[PDB]
């Protein structure tokens, strides 16, 4: 059908009552109404700020919004109370609307001390709006002490958006909104906040993780819930966990390298929330976030046709500033979305068509080879879309210099299909690691995925150290190992937590598992600290690892996030040595994300 996609402001940060207007959570009320709900910030800060929950009406489809109304009241004068970071969730059983958000007096999340008594100013409280006329008029209660099983949690937020309803199981009609909490140990934690009986009584589940944040959770195809959720760690990723007894308990926490995310809230919903269990149209989802590691930005749509396992199609909805978002399923099988764009709450209106998926993941697998070689790799595809396409065609984003080229034989209904890249690089390609992308282009939607080609580079993994001078490991994981494990965010530190450590020069020396031809190191500085970061270098290498030969290089590297390239004649070793003689301000220690080695395989 005809794609669309289309956006309006429903907050200015300035306009109607506020200075900052942030944290956006959206829902269908049972009539068919769309409510948005937001913080108004007076002094432009979570809480402790005296802030309110607001909300505006569509009677329309979203066409048109109605003024902006108060939910619950902040309060500037004694007793002062802020209320903050909204979640909405509506029992579509019963009819009634809750709204979830803090009530803070005079701490925020981090500050935060243990007990439940909605007297104590310095406890962050656990507060629900309730609605039984769609949002219109609400009450409010606090729900702190039914939702504290462990005395040791001393703060507790419920994640901003929308929480569900299961439809499914022994558990079906069960109201999940997900929280964040602090435990004695200071550890941030997920935990399901859940009701059985309609939302007149809630608990907590049994809480899982270290490092999370705020979270979200959905009803998969077979009734499973699965968690996807801030990383409070900042890797870079979503991290993701799974429970079988309706949220309850969760297995282990894993990263979801699929799912890049710059520590920042995100939404997963269903696509097809009515559909019935185990069919194809119930392991649909779609998610939103900033496809990012770095900045808040590119925004983005995914969609996933296997209950999360792939997300084959994702399109762009803002390339520009893009922080939280929350979608929701509307009545006429569009899907809508409200985000913060940098100046408020906007709010955007998409349809299936618009993001132009077909359901066919497919793999292509990671290949190296030398300069002014060619090498042809098998491409995979599941088509999980049900249909046939007769001619479809693979299209790649490489080098312009590269030549690249890739074909797939057609699509059958519930069939795997092969097909195939031929990649060339010219002589005098520099040594790296080059993502290629790959577009399936199908008359029915296209799917994506990437894949990585490493050229003139040798293989880390049969790499091993074969000496340091320092390595902390008393007081976080600074092995020298850290180097060689293809990782940006794990690195080599030289030891710090005793005072006796030595400063400058350092030295990590690699056995490279056999002699090579090589010609060159690639740096990568330690990407979340300026501190440790290498300046003034040599190079040397070795036959027996007792004689070195060199320097064979020297120079003084930029303090560049980007890999960093030392160069020297070709020459044959077994081990190779980077000295590091000054770090760039001067400080003591040294620390390197990644070395890699130039030269042939
Ligand atoms: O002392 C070496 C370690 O410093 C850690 O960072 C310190 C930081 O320099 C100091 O200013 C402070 O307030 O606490 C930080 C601890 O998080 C680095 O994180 C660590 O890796 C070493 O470099
Ligand atoms: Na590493």
Same mark, same amino acid.
């Given at each position: 059908?005809? %794609?669309? *996609?289309?956006?309006? =402001? #429903?907050?200015?940060?300035?306009?109607?009552?506020?200075?900052?207007?942030?944290? %956006?959570?959206?829902?269908?009320?049972?009539?068919?109404?769309?409510?948005?709900?937001?913080?108004?910030?007076?002094?432009?800060?979570?809480?402790?700020?005296?802030?309110?929950?607001?909300?505006?009406?569509?009677?329309?489809?979203?066409?048109?919004?109605?003024?902006?109304?108060?939910?619950?009241?902040?309060?500037? /004068?004694?007793?002062?109370?802020?209320?903050?970071?909204?979640?909405?969730?509506?029992?579509?059983?019963?009819?009634?609307?809750?709204?979830?958000?803090?009530?803070? @007096?005079?701490?925020?999340?981090?500050?935060?001390?243990? +007990?439940?008594?909605?007297?104590?100013?310095?406890?962050?409280?656990?507060?629900?709006?309730?609605?039984?006329?769609?949002?219109?008029?609400?009450?409010?209660?606090? !729900?702190?002490?039914? !939702?504290?099983?462990?005395?040791?949690?001393?703060?507790?937020?419920?994640?901003?958006?929308?929480?569900?309803?299961?439809?499914?199981?022994? $558990?079906?009609?069960?109201?999940?909104? @997900?929280?964040?909490?602090?435990?004695?140990?200071?550890?941030?934690?997920?935990?399901?906040?859940?009701?059985?009986?309609?939302?007149?009584?809630?608990?907590?589940?049994?809480?899982?993780?270290?490092?999370?944040?705020?979270?979200?959770?959905?009803?998969?195809?077979?009734?499973?819930?699965?968690?996807?959720?801030?990383?409070?760690?900042?890797? +870079?990723?979503?991290?993701?966990?799974?429970?079988?007894?309706?949220?309850?308990? &969760?297995?282990?926490?894993?990263?979801?390298?699929?799912?890049?995310? %710059?520590?920042?809230?995100?939404?997963?919903?269903?696509?097809?929330?009515?559909?019935?269990?185990?069919?194809?149209?119930?392991?649909?989802?779609?998610?939103?976030?900033?496809?990012?590691? /770095?900045?808040?930005?590119?925004?983005?749509?995914?969609?996933?046709?296997?209950?999360?396992?792939?997300?084959?199609?994702?399109?762009?909805?803002?390339?520009?500033?893009?922080? *939280?978002?929350?979608?929701?399923?509307?009545?006429?099988?569009?899907?809508?979305?409200?985000?913060?764009? +940098?100046?408020?709450?906007? &709010?955007?209106?998409?349809?299936?068509?618009?993001?132009?998926?077909?359901?066919?993941?497919?793999?292509?697998?990671?290949?190296? #080879?030398?300069?002014? @070689?060619?090498?042809?790799?098998?491409?995979?595809?599941?088509?999980?879309?049900?249909?046939?396409?007769?001619?479809?065609?693979?299209?790649?984003?490489?080098?312009?210099?590269?030549?690249?080229?890739?074909?797939?034989?057609?699509?059958?209904?519930?069939?795997?299909?092969?097909?195939?890249?031929?990649?060339?690089?010219?002589?005098?390609?520099?040594?790296?690691?080059?993502?290629?992308?790959?577009?399936?282009?199908?008359?029915?939607?296209?799917?994506?995925?990437?894949?990585?080609?490493?050229?003139?580079?040798?293989?880390?993994?049969?790499?091993?150290?074969? =000496?340091?001078?320092?390595?902390?490991?008393?007081?976080?994981?600074?092995?020298?190992?850290?180097?060689?494990?293809?990782?940006?965010?794990?690195?080599?530190?030289?030891?710090?937590?005793?005072?006796?450590?030595?400063?400058?020069?350092?030295?990590?020396?690699?056995?490279?598992?056999?002699?090579?031809?090589?010609?060159?190191?690639?740096?990568?500085?330690?990407?979340?600290?300026?501190?440790?970061?290498?300046?003034?270098?040599?190079?040397?290498?070795?036959?027996?690892? /007792?004689?070195?030969?060199?320097?064979?290089?020297?120079?003084?590297?930029?303090?560049?996030?980007?890999?960093?390239?030392?160069?020297?004649?070709?020459?044959?070793?077994?081990?190779?040595?980077?000295?590091?003689?000054?770090?760039?301000?001067? $400080?003591?220690?040294?620390?390197?994300?990644?070395?890699?080695?130039?030269?042939?395989?």
């Amino acid at each position: 059908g005809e %794609p669309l *996609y289309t956006e309006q =402001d #429903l907050a200015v940060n300035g306009r109607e009552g506020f200075p900052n207007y942030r944290i %956006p959570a959206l829902t269908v009320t049972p009539d068919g109404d769309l409510l948005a709900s937001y913080d108004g910030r007076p002094t432009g800060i979570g809480a402790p700020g005296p802030n309110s929950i607001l909300q505006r009406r569509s009677t329309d489809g979203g066409r048109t919004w109605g003024e902006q109304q108060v939910v619950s009241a902040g309060q500037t /004068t004694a007793p002062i109370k802020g209320f903050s970071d909204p979640s909405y969730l509506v029992d579509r059983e019963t009819g009634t609307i809750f709204n979830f958000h803090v009530y803070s @007096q005079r701490q925020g999340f981090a500050g935060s001390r243990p +007990g439940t008594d909605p007297a104590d100013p310095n406890v962050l409280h656990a507060n629900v709006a309730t609605s039984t006329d769609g949002g219109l008029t609400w009450s409010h209660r606090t !729900i702190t002490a039914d !939702i504290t099983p462990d005395p040791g949690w001393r703060s507790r937020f419920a994640a901003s958006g929308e929480g569900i309803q299961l439809r499914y199981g022994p $558990h079906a009609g069960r109201l999940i909104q @997900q929280y964040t909490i602090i435990n004695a140990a200071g550890a941030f934690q997920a935990v399901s906040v859940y009701s059985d009986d309609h939302g007149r009584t809630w608990r907590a589940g049994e809480a899982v993780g270290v490092g999370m944040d705020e979270n979200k959770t959905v009803e998969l195809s077979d009734g499973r819930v699965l968690l996807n959720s801030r990383d409070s760690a900042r890797s +870079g990723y979503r991290k993701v966990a799974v429970s079988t007894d309706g949220g309850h308990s &969760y297995g282990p926490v894993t990263i979801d390298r699929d799912l890049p995310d %710059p520590t920042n809230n995100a939404s997963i919903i269903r696509a097809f929330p009515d559909a019935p269990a185990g069919s194809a149209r119930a392991k649909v989802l779609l998610f939103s976030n900033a496809a990012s590691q /770095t900045s808040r930005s590119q925004g983005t749509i995914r969609m996933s046709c296997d209950d999360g396992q792939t997300w084959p199609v994702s399109k762009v909805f803002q390339p520009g500033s893009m922080s *939280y978002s929350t979608l929701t399923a509307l009545p006429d099988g569009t899907y809508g979305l409200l985000y913060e764009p +940098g100046t408020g709450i906007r &709010y955007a209106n998409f349809n299936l068509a618009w993001l132009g998926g077909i359901c066919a993941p497919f793999t292509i697998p990671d290949v190296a #080879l030398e300069p002014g @070689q060619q090498v042809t790799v098998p491409v995979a595809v599941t088509n999980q879309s049900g249909i046939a396409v007769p001619k479809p065609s693979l299209q790649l984003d490489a080098s312009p210099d590269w030549q690249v080229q890739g074909s797939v034989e057609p699509l059958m209904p519930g069939r795997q299909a092969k097909g195939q890249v031929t990649i060339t690089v010219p002589a005098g390609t520099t040594p790296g690691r080059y993502r290629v992308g790959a577009t399936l282009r199908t008359s029915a939607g296209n799917a994506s995925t990437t894949f990585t080609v490493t050229v003139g580079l040798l293989d880390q993994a049969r790499m091993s150290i074969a =000496d340091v001078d320092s390595e902390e490991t008393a007081r976080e994981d600074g092995r020298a190992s850290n180097v060689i494990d293809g990782n940006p965010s794990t690195f080599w530190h030289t030891e710090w937590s005793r005072a006796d450590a030595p400063g400058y020069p350092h030295r990590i020396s690699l056995d490279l598992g056999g002699t090579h031809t090589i010609s060159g190191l690639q740096y990568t500085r330690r990407q979340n600290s300026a501190n440790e970061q290498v300046a003034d270098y040599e190079i040397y290498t070795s036959l027996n690892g /007792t004689t070195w030969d060199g320097p064979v290089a020297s120079g003084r590297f930029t303090t560049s996030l980007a890999p960093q390239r030392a160069v020297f004649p070709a020459r044959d070793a077994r081990y190779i040595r980077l000295v590091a003689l000054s770090e760039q301000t001067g $400080h003591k220690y040294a620390a390197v994300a990644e070395l890699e080695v130039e030269g042939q395989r």
